[PDB]
Amino acid sequence: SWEVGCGAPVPLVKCDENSPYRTITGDCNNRRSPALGAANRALARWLPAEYEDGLALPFGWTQRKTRNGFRVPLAREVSNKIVGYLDEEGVLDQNRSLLFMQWGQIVDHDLDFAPETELGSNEHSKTQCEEYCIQGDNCFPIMFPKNDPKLKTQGKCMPFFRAGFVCPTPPYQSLAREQINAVTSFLDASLVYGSEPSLASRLRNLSSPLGLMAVNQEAWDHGLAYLPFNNKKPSPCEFINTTARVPCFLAGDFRASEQILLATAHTLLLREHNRLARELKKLNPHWNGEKLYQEARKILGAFIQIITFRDYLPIVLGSEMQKWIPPYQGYNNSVDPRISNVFTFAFRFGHMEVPSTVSRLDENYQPWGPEAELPLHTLFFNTWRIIKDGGIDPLVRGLLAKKSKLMNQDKMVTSELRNKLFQPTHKIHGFDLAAINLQRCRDHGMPGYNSWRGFCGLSQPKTLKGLQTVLKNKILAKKLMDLYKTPDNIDIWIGGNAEPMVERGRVGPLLACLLGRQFQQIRDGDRFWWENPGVFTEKQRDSLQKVSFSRLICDNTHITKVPLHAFQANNYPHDFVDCSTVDKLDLSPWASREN
C-alpha cells in the first residue's frame, strides 16, 4: 500500500517533450515520471528512516529512550573525543591540490541541499533556541558536555534547527518525515543558474539579447566580471567587517558565499557562461537571447559532468571506481535519479579534507602581500577580501599550488571548522561543523553504521575486536565503542569516515559504495547526460573531451601558468606551463548554417 499522493510544495508546470534544454526545476527529464529528480521534493530513501518514535523524532531527543538499549552520545562529545586535534603539521595530502577539496564542494552543492526550517521571520523561537537552549519543535540544540571549554565561554549549547520536510513545513505528523532536496538531483550546473524559475530569471541579464548572466556593476576585477551583490540585508558578509560593508554574492545557489574559495569557484563559472555566450553569438549572429543562454548553459552542464566523472571521481573512488560506475551504456529510463538521503551525508567526507588556511600567491606564485596566509575561519562569508584585497587570481593560484588536507584517523577535522565555524544567522565564530553533521544524521533519521555495511554487503562488526579489524585501528575503535557501546549505533557520518582508504582513493569501502551507487544513478538516469546520443552531436562530443579545468582557468583569469592536471599536487614552476599550450574548447562545431 503506497502513498505517492502527497505533494504541492512543489512548483510544477507542463512539459515540452521534444525540447532540447533541461528545465530549471529538473522536471520533464524522465518522460514516464516527470517529477523524478526535480528540485523541491523529498530525498529518496534507500532504507527506511529510523526515528525515536518511528515517525519524526530524532534519536537523542528523548534522553530516556535509548537506541538498541543505549543512550546515544552527544554529538559534541564525539566531536571532542574523536574528531578534533591540535597539530596541523604533517596533515596535508602530498598528492591532491586544494582544488580537489573545492571541486567536491561544487559537485555537492549542485546535487543536494536540505535547508533548515523557517516559520521564523520575526520569530522568538529564533531566540528561545539560542538564548535558553530549550529543546522543542524545530529547535534541537547541541548540548555541551561537562569539561567543554565552550561552556565557560559560549553558553550551554549550540543552536541548531531541524531540516525541512515535505508535504508542509509547520506542525505536521502522519507518515514518516522525509527531508527536502531544494535543488535538482541531476548534475546540471543548477548552482550557477538556480533551481527555481524566479531565481533563474533574476540571475539573467535581460536588458539585452546576448543571453548573458547579470554581473556586478559596482566592482570589476581587472575588467573581468564579478557575481552580482545580494539584495538582502541583514547580510552576513557585511557583519564580519562592518567597515568594509561588502555584501554576499547572489548566485544560482544560496551557499555560494560560505567561504571565499567557493565564491571564487562560482565566479569562474559565471565568467565562463558569459565568455561562452559572447563567443556563440559571434558564430551564429541571428540567434536570440534565449538560444544563446540555453546553448551556453548546456555546454557548461556538459563541462561540470566531464570534469567530475573523468578527472574527479577516479581519484575519490580509486580502484573501486569500476566496481560501481561501469562504462557508460546509454540512458536507462528505469534508473531512479533522485539523490538519496544518506548520500548527502556520505558526500560530507569532504569536511575532513579542508586545511586550516588559504593562501594568495602573486604572479611568481610567491606570498602575495605580508598577511598572505589567512586562517580559514576569517574567510567564512568573506567577500570583502576578494573585492578589496586583489580579486580572485591570487586565490585561484592558491587552489592550484596548495594541497588539500588528508583524511587521517587521529586528525579528522580542523579546529577552523570544529570550533570556529560561522553561521549566517548567528553572531559568533564558534560553531562545530563535526557536531552539526552528527546532529543532522539523527535529525534525518539515518540508520546506524551497521545497517549501511549490510546494505553494501560488507561485514558488520558487533564486538570491539570486530571494529578494530575493520577500522584497522585499536585506539579509534576503542574511543568509538566507549561512546557508542555498539557499532550498530555509530552514526553513518563518522562510521563511514573512520575506515581506511581504498587503493588510490580518498574514501573507504562503505563510502565508495554509497558514493558509487549515487553517481552511477545520476548518470544512467539523466536523459540529458552529455554522452547520450542525440543530446550533443558526435562532433560536439569530440570537442567537449578537451575541456580542462586548467583551460577554464586560462580563459577567465590573468593566470598564464597552470598545471596540466590541476587535481594532483603540482609544484611551481616545474609542473606549470604557459596557457598558450593548453587545449581549447573548439566551438565551430556549434555553428549552424542556413539555405
Ligand code: HEM
Ligand atoms: C566551511 C565548509 C566547507 C569548506 C571550507 C565545506 C566543504 C565541503 C566539501 C569540500 C564537501 C564535499 C567534497 C562538502 C559537502 C557537504 N557539505 Fe560542507 N562545507 C562547509 C560547511 C558546511 C555546512 C555548515 C553545512 C551544513 C550542515 C548542516 O547540516 O546544517 C555543510 C553541508 C554539506 C553537505 C550537506 C548538503 C545538503 O544536502 O543539505 C554536503 C554534502 N557544509 N562540504
Ligand SMILES: *[C@@H]1O[C@H](CO)[C@@H](O[C@@H]2O[C@H](CO)[C@@H](O[C@H]3O[C@H](CO)[C@@H](O)[C@H](O)[C@@H]3O)[C@H](O)[C@H]2NC(C)=O)[C@H](O)[C@H]1NC(C)=O
Ligand atoms: C598522484 O595522483 C595521480 C592520479 O591519481 C597519479 O597519476 C596517475 O597514475 C595513473 C595510474 O593508473 C595513470 O592513469 C592514466 O593512465 C593512462 C594514461 O597513461 C590512461 O589511459 C588511464 O585511463 C589513466 O587515466 C596516470 O599516470 C595518472 N593519471 C592522471 C589522470 O594523471 C600519480 O601516480 C600520483 N602520484 C603518486 C606519487 O602516487
Ligand SMILES: *[C@@H]1O[C@H](CO)[C@@H](O[C@@H]2O[C@H](CO)[C@@H](O[C@H]3O[C@H](CO)[C@@H](O)[C@H](O)[C@@H]3O)[C@H](O)[C@H]2NC(C)=O)[C@H](O)[C@H]1NC(C)=O
Ligand atoms: C575591514 O576591511 C578593511 C578594508 O576594506 C580592512 O582594512 C584595510 O586593510 C589594510 C589595513 O590593515 C589597508 O591596506 C594596507 O595597504 C595600504 C596600501 O595603500 C597601506 O597604506 C597600509 O599598510 C594598509 O594596511 C586597507 O587600506 C584597509 N582599508 C581600510 C578602510 O581600513 C580592515 O582591516 C578590515 N577589518 C577587519 C577586522 O577585517
Ligand SMILES: *[C@@H]1O[C@H](CO)[C@@H](O[C@@H]2O[C@H](CO)[C@@H](O)[C@H](O)[C@H]2NC(C)=O)[C@H](O)[C@H]1NC(C)=O
Ligand atoms: C547586461 O549586458 C549589457 C550589455 O553587455 C551590459 O552593458 C554594458 O556594460 C558594460 C559596463 O557597464 C559596458 O560595455 C557598457 O556600459 C554596456 N554596453 C552596452 C552595449 O550596453 C550590462 O552591464 C549588463 N547588465 C547587468 C545587470 O549585468
Ligand SMILES: *[C@@H]1O[C@H](CO)[C@@H](O[C@@H]2O[C@H](CO)[C@@H](O)[C@H](O)[C@H]2NC(C)=O)[C@H](O)[C@H]1NC(C)=O
Ligand atoms: C536498466 O536499469 C535497471 C534498474 O537498475 C536494471 O535492472 C536490473 O536488471 C536485472 C536483470 O534484468 C533485474 O533482474 C533486476 O531486478 C534489476 N536490478 C535492480 C536492483 O533493479 C537493468 O539491468 C538496466 N538495463 C540496461 C539495458 O541497462
Ligand SMILES: CC(=O)Oc1ccccc1C(=O)O
Ligand atoms: C551548505 C553550505 O555549504 O552552507 C552554509 C554553512 C554555514 C553557514 C551558511 C551556509 C549557507 O549556505 O548560507
Ligand SMILES: [Ca+2]
Ligand atoms: Ca543539480
